[PDB]
Amino acid sequence: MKGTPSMGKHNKGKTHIRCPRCGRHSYNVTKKYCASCGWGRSKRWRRYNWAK
Template sequence: MKGTPSFGKMNKNKTHIRCRRCGRHSFNVSKGYCVACGYGRSKRMRRYSWQNKKSWTRQRLR
């Protein structure tokens, strides 16, 4: 069987479980690391500058 009926079988098993470091439901079981905090892949917390809005963009134009 292929096509549309096959897509119904895609939600049977869990891809992500709760992460033991950040607590979010984003630990990939098959890959073995958390996509939110990077647990299982690195010792440091996963964070980037583009996650937060820059402070100069919040200032009012004059």
């Protein structure tokens, strides 16, 4: 059930929406901050040195 049948349940929900600061589809609506730029939890822009 974990494969194709369970993919059927990804048709209606969401974890992220578009972020007003960076524009990516990365704003976690439940956590209320952006997974990409950190908007909503960090006034500084999130970017780590381990990322190229």
